[PDB]
Design a protein around this ligand. Sequence first.
Ligand SMILES: Cc1ccc(S(=O)(=O)O)cc1
Ligand SMILES: Cc1ccc(S(=O)(=O)O)cc1
Ligand SMILES: Cc1ccc(S(=O)(=O)O)cc1
Length: 205
Amino acid sequence: GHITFAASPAIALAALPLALASFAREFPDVTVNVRDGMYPAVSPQLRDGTLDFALTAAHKHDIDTDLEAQPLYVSDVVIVGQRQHPMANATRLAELQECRWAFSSAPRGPGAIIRNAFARYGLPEPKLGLVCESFLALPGVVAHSDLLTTMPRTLYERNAFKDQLCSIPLQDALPNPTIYVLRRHDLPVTPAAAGLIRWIQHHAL
Ligand SMILES: Cc1ccc(S(=O)(=O)O)cc1
Ligand SMILES: Cc1ccc(S(=O)(=O)O)cc1
Ligand SMILES: Cc1ccc(S(=O)(=O)O)cc1
């Protein structure tokens, strides 16, 4: 009666605590073990059965045949910079094209969201200022620099540096990844795991 799973940062910050509280009421005899995990790194842990499932951004098409991918929702990606950033008031990606970026993690590699965003608008590649794979470190790094970055809106709202950050009110499109449940399709879904996932969906809305 154990559930071991991984959760992505957006999930970890809002949905997870509320979900675990609702779930402990409904299934009080289940022991939960939760860890950090993003796609692709969770893939072999799901594959070998160390994780029962993982809640993470991913793209349907990159995902091994072993895994099924139940979409839960679409992420809300924001561009974030220190509060007085020269580009704080920008509305178009072309206006950011000379800024330096903290490339943050994403399923297709560090900085993949903003590189793809710039590409889709026929812009040149965004300038690399630094690679920061740690969503825990990222808000404080951006707050102490003039680097821009992308992050889920939940992390922008829930970090200890939020009074020193701003979100860029972009009117151009950003390629928001979809948040999936990832699990071996050959693994039957226990009532408890299904219950916990439904709670994370319910609270993440
Ligand atoms: C770009 C991006 C990175 C990570 C996530 S998260 O997996 O929801 O925390 C969503 C969107
Ligand atoms: C925290 C931090 C990280 C990186 C830089 S920068 O490379 O000069 O933009 C400045 C400050
Ligand atoms: C509405 C909405 C959906 C998703 C997110 S996010 O998970 O923080 O990217 C924030 C807000």
